[PDB]
């Protein structure tokens, strides 16, 4: 506390120089914090998982010899045909050209 401020400022400046630190004696807002924050993009953008997963549609070309059946897809197609037979099918979609 009795150490003159000039002496303590000389130590701060030299120390900052040796340790590659930003010396801002005035205290002006410099934005250095923004320049030092970490990039969270990679972590944020992987939230929902890796998109390059093997999918059932790729199995018919990876393994031509084997014939796989998608029961979930097959069930949906059967429900579509059933509704067509009862007359409860879907209306034909209007064309933008019209």
């Amino acid at each position: 506390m009795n150490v003159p401020k000039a002496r303590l400022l000389k130590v701060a400046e030299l120390s900052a120089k040796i340790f590659d630190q930003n010396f801002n004696p005035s205290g002006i807002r410099t934005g250095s914090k923004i320049l030092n924050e970490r990039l969270k993009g990679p972590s944020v953008a992987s939230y929902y998982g890796n998109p390059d997963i093997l999918k059932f549609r790729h199995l018919k070309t990876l393994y031509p010899d084997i014939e796989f059946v998608d029961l979930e897809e097959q069930y949906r197609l059967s429900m579509v045909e059933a509704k067509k037979r009862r007359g409860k099918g879907a209306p034909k979609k209007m064309k933008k050209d019209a």
Binding site: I28, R29, T30, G31, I34, L35, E37, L39, K40, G41, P42, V44, A45, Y47, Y48, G49, N50, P51, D52, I53
Partner: protein, 113 residues
Amino acid sequence: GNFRFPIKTKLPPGFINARILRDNFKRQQFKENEILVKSLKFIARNMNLPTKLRLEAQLKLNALPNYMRSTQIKNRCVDSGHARFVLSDFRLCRYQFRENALKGNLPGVKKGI
């Protein structure tokens, strides 16, 4: 042929719904533009630069699309898409957390004391 978002994005590998697609798109574009937003924010908040350059950066920041905003990213359940009471340790909503926990799907989760 007509993707709903301005830029082409790959689909998440698991459960999909409209809200998940919207959130995922914002996540990908935040990563592509994160550096740009930080650089403009620096120029706009650096008091050593002239006010004119600072105001130019602020104007550019206000003109960026909403899908580049970090504050618009919302954690959703990766299994159901529900966006309330989502545990970040598993990225699942409370109900899906309980169901997965009891099935032994969460690596080290057991029932409490």
